[PDB]
């Protein structure tokens, strides 16, 4: 048995009635419990994520099967059997908190690994590529996809205008308009690092790496009609499903695979291996098994732990570094930047975001300082041997630059259509039909000129792809 | 033709490519356009409304048919034919911003009247009563209705626990679990002030008043199964419907009626006329027509205008005052309190929130001071005749207090069950069946003890009501 | 020996050099340590207190000498020898952080008592009265005293315009323009609760109380010329003095006295005993010793503990209640209100502000939730006997109301000049000379009309007071 | 004559009394004027600048005498006689907002030019060099100089520990401990761009440039004893002096000079021309006159205009670009980053910060959106010819990179002592004496080892310099 108290720790005599002039009269200003309780209620909400606002989280463990020390000095990957705690958030992308989990969208697949050498965030999506290859375009892309800023309703004519004029998007769209555009839930779902990263071993040798997560539950998708049926009955079925699996002891898991590529392979490929609109052939760069992630614990509080969770691709650990991927480069900045605003300058002190590894540095103050700081020395260099010092054992690599000059210039070999064609051809006939059907429902009402440009882009990917789409949209393209 | 610029007004040479070390190398910190554009994108979002987060807005005009100067000095109501601009936001209640408009919930009905004597906000709902009668209980109620703080899913067992132990809620539930719990859209919908207010005429005479909005489009509701059918295909159908009506010139409208009651009738009744769990008889206190509100203009920008709109029941104008209703009394505080956090200390300067009437006072500064302030004098009293002075012509009334002590104590004659029974008996058989059906779906999974207490509460309202609900739930209540 | 780390817990390899294109080239965006470190530095600052921004804090102990249970049920006062931890902040008032401690001003004297029944804040000043008696005037008074909003320099012509037109200020000014307007430091300084409060014993009997703190070090003040001498060489001498005393083991202390007055004495006094422009006679209502407060510990971190400290007069504990004082009534609201903005919605979780008594309630969420919340139940009433419940043993008293109407109307018996005269006459000749000298230096440049009105006010207090001031200003007052 | 109103535009009937239970009773919650007025008062303050918190601003005009088109395409410099409006803020550095203007510090000298091709900020200081040459060290430096985080008092032992271990500081200190460490006021003061920048002409030819501002009022400085004497009587004398000059029509002015250096001179020098611890010889790179700035208008509102002013070295205009200076590079990021936090995401809409040039881009929303946005298109590329487009005429240069790797590594030729010695020798004997005197007063209490290292650093600058300092400190350095 416990007292209800104010935040001052004074027990509350009456949590039912305001303080009034007699039993029915107007309310008095001297009602500290009322004001305090209303004032806090009034401040419960914080800004949602600018994208991936709808989501769900869970904790678990990652266990190494095959040490990766040949290729990366990353501590968490150093030994067979090595276990690292994780927190994972899954999400949709475009619509706000509260929006349905039955909509078409990439799904987020964000994993925080609590390593001995710091927190490592792998901030992935289910699909292995992206729409654009430079961060400067991200707000444009997002704005085009988001609900129209007048009507508050998402409009195909807006995002198809942007996508058609951004033909590097063609490969991504060829995945997103398969039925994998609507995963059945978060468990029966693929995961992908998307970007090429750099793995650096104990000799300082670098390889390019890509990450893949393979669901123990298998991949399952929803047709447009299956999605609608679920939407009727539950706008939050994926969030429900994840919680319930875990609660009943049916823990979902994913195996982690990598592909590895020598840096030297750049110059021989017909695409840039750091263009995130591209995948790497699994024939030429086979999947290699690393280990397994099992999710086995729901959070105690959704707001404190899932809503306040902060991931960043720039949360890298020794042995794992960014590539030159220009999309990735922008992300390094944008996540902690947005998080400082969404969560506060001290967001890294929120329990879910805290490292297991020790934190010692000379930063200070900021809104909501709760950590009991002490000491006179908040500057380096200083004369005190016991104060925190740099540690050159932990320097990052020094990647070679091939450019002469600071430039704003697209990558060479953009090759916007080829892989999109390859992917189309890899689809079964059923999958090809679903693709075309899903594309047609999206494009049928879009401006004619934009519609034609979309057809042309998919025609450049593959002539059958393009023609089938044109037939299904009733567009005669013979004259071109 | 225009340049794309930075916020510094410098034309942008390249809005496609980040600045890099050659065409494929990593990105440079000296890229002001990239950082500025990503930084602003990163800060687009502000906190959603703590309740009523999902909603839609429109502008229109209110026109007086019958002048009300006999009963209120309110300027906007003073003359036949007098037109006043309005902004209106409609909303659901519980779920966040992106949530479906097909869920059961009261609907918000908030009207901002831009009057010559200031802005008047009539912050209503469709349904004419409320679940509780004291503001101290509002965070409890909301917390019980909101998604469970662990699962992120709304749970009938949680809100039913609260509602059953809060039997003043019995009348509201009797309305909410009719099919009016899911209005077909925002146009075909009732509006209510809910609270009793005080109207004060030029002689200082006071009457109690209640407000009612009657849709020109008629009231139409959705069954559970009709709601699901819509939800399958559109999670923002009401928002769509409102915009589209207005866009095609099919302007929705509502006629404003009041009921007026002498303060001296308090003793003539078996309920407190300022208990917002109660309605007033339309036989005894007939509806009197005031005028008509027509919505005829969509906003230019949803975020700037609808999302940032701020209403408060405390935005009262001379002649229109609060009653002693304890629920209302807390609302007077909570809305501007939450708005200062949600929108900033200067939220009253956001264009939609600005009065048409002049503003002059001695307030200053605050985040985002955009108004070009000037002058040396920011204090009153002062020696300068041309500086703003109080105007005793605009004093409010001095309501009589019947209590002689500061107390926390429930009102006399709570009478929690009677009007609920009256409302039940007023329903057609079809409506009664829908009520029972809707209640049974909601209650069938809740804790047995809580389930029985619900039945007992609705039994106290009306024995048939109760028994029918018990039968439908399979609960044998013979032993009691 | 410790590593310098990022906030992710990764050891920093180089805390000296940014990451660049060769040894002298421009900087790269992929420098997480640089961006994280700069970004936190960039966010160190929070808003300063709107008033009392300059100040210093310390911890200590309060020990009861005479138990007060006859007059108050306050737990911390219940018996002889009982010790309670305190935190105390002293301050100036008007000028910002950084401003000199040698300026004229009241000094703040804020004491936070960490009691077993919750935190009790006695938010005092050195001087025992105030300039105004209604909180509605506080922004005006402050705005008049603060630096001119055009020039950023405090202007006597401004605050004298306000004070002269606000003659209830006459008593306060008669204290503030003695040399006690500049205490020598924070240790050799009076403390005052200022307001009358209500003390309520276990039988529910109420008395009016006033609080007084008497320095073990004695009261010492600075002349204008002694202040100027110190100001030349140290703009933080009081903050220095406090810290150094405590560091040397020379702990400053204050004895707590109260005066106690029956509520029934209201009606026979010639002033309102809850007018905070009034003191009570120490002959008629003698000082009664309660105990002693010793300050013996400097904070570990000035920002975290002294800058983020939050006191409110509404932080009351059972047995100690507000009076009807209209100045106090506004303060009950304004402190937690300003704190929510200055510090965050969760400021009560900042360690210095935390109670020693348990906190359990149903509030949730808010920016920077760091407390690891858990559980499904965040609403009351609920069906769970182990969840926090109200406890009616802790109800507050039910003060009698003498008014029958909601009014805006000055108190009866304002008696603006009498006690000012009494205070003037109580001064030694030396003190009277200092008063006149200090007033003359402040008034000599102000508008002639305002200057006359000031003279007139102090003349109404005492004719010698007024004439001496007029002579010293060279103002001929014969025609009046 | 005007009414006092609420922010709702309702006239205020009584700005003197709170609303109470009779003329002497407690206060009612239903007092919207009181709560609104207090609540805004409670939110007046925003965070101060993390450095240069104390300062003063003024508007004026810059007029070109010699067009610079041969060296830079900058529009504002293109024609003889061309006038551009400016806003200028001057400041100290270390202590907070209310702190004295008599302290030792660099002074800030920040100029915002409202040009036809965007706002150009030249964010200078009076002194022409800086303590450090890499932004990664800035928070360390600042933390060492700032008041101790325990005591809130600045401590020479702290900043001397940092400076001695950071010997690149030796030149800066040799300026700052002359009497120019305390300018007499803001008018009789030097100004400096400090950094080398890049000027780019219409042919794309680049030169290195340095800026210098020469006061029409001449340079005047204060001895330690003259500073103390002013401090006694006025803690804001520079702010006062600026305002009063301008109010009287005695407008202060500065002539703008540049030095220009070919990029190819890098190899011709014994220091890095982009090392901001270095000046360029005026013999070898003579001062060339550009024009004159006159300050002639005080702001209307100190908070709205001077306090909310935002300057950034990254507010560059076509023809004026950053250099590779690593100190400057960090600044490009840190100003807008801090400003977003200090002022809000939309701080560029605060009137003083607004460009005169048109602003058109696809950014949207953010706290306090007051600009009336409209339109459906917030993304580029788009199909609409009339929407804002990039303009390749406004591309920046493509500086050549000499490094082939991403590195963290000090510049070559740091040459930490030489120019410090040159500057010492350039001092008159009087100035040398003042230098030594000022240094000795600062060093005499610091840790002996730190003290010795300081002496050694200044000895390496110049043996006389070092020996004189050692003698004056009573440190025997025979034996080194
Ligand atoms: C330039 C490209 C991109 C930018 C600028 C960007 C930006 C952002 C931002 C600002 C957030 C909000 C972060 C927060 O509030 O914590 C976010 C969330 C997220 N983004 Fe991205 N994003 C980009 C590309 C991608 C890519 C390629 C992926 C996957 C490969 C991705 C996956 C995610 C995920 C999963 C989240 C949610 C993290 C969470 O659940 O808390 N984004 N993004
Ligand atoms: C103690 C009882 C209540 C409290 C404390 C309360 C509190 C609040 C708060 C804090 C908000 C969000 C405001 C904002 O973010 O701007 C809100 C929104 C709202 N409430 Fe209530 N409320 C209560 C009862 C009611 C009642 C009785 C009605 C109708 C009679 C109602 C109708 C609304 C509406 C319509 C909105 C949304 C306004 C809009 O569209 O922007 N509420 N309430
Ligand atoms: O990116 C998306 C998401 C949903 C629908 C269509 C597209 Cl292109
Ligand atoms: O208040 C609500 C809202 C939706 C469903 C049920 C209840 Cl009680
Ligand atoms: O205890 C109960 C329960 C349900 C209906 C009637 C009664 Cl009396
Ligand atoms: O090593 C030192 C120290 C101080 C002065 C001169 C020298 Cl060479
Ligand atoms: Cl650090
Ligand atoms: Cl706030
Ligand atoms: Cl005001
Ligand atoms: Cl609570
Ligand atoms: Cl921010
Ligand atoms: Cl843009
Ligand atoms: Na009429
Ligand atoms: Na006793």
PDB file of C-alpha atoms and ligand atoms in Angstrom, chain A residues 4-7 12 15 33 36-37, chain B residues 136 139-140 143, chain C residues 360-364 378-380, ligand 10:
ATOM      1  CA  UNK A   4      -0.385   8.990  -3.911  1.00  0.00           C
ATOM      2  CA  UNK A   5       1.938  12.039  -3.638  1.00  0.00           C
ATOM      3  CA  UNK A   6       2.727  15.285  -5.353  1.00  0.00           C
ATOM      4  CA  UNK A   7       6.109  15.586  -7.049  1.00  0.00           C
ATOM      5  CA  UNK A  12      -2.384  13.740  -1.581  1.00  0.00           C
ATOM      6  CA  UNK A  15      -7.293  13.028  -5.697  1.00  0.00           C
ATOM      7  CA  UNK A  33      -1.976  19.194  -6.628  1.00  0.00           C
ATOM      8  CA  UNK A  36       0.937  20.330 -10.805  1.00  0.00           C
ATOM      9  CA  UNK A  37      -1.039  17.343 -12.105  1.00  0.00           C
TER      10      UNK A  37
ATOM     11  CA  UNK B 136      -8.698  16.880 -11.306  1.00  0.00           C
ATOM     12  CA  UNK B 139      -5.437  13.008 -16.607  1.00  0.00           C
ATOM     13  CA  UNK B 140      -6.750   9.783 -15.009  1.00  0.00           C
ATOM     14  CA  UNK B 143      -4.520   7.823 -19.172  1.00  0.00           C
TER      15      UNK B 143
ATOM     16  CA  UNK C 360       4.296   7.914  -6.316  1.00  0.00           C
ATOM     17  CA  UNK C 361       1.698   9.204  -8.669  1.00  0.00           C
ATOM     18  CA  UNK C 362       0.180   8.716 -12.048  1.00  0.00           C
ATOM     19  CA  UNK C 363       1.960  11.448 -13.996  1.00  0.00           C
ATOM     20  CA  UNK C 364       4.041  10.301 -16.976  1.00  0.00           C
ATOM     21  CA  UNK C 378      -1.372   5.249 -14.631  1.00  0.00           C
ATOM     22  CA  UNK C 379      -4.925   6.258 -13.666  1.00  0.00           C
ATOM     23  CA  UNK C 380      -6.889   6.478 -10.383  1.00  0.00           C
TER      24      UNK C 380
HETATM   25 CL1  LIG E  10      -1.431  11.809 -10.225  1.00  0.00          CL
END
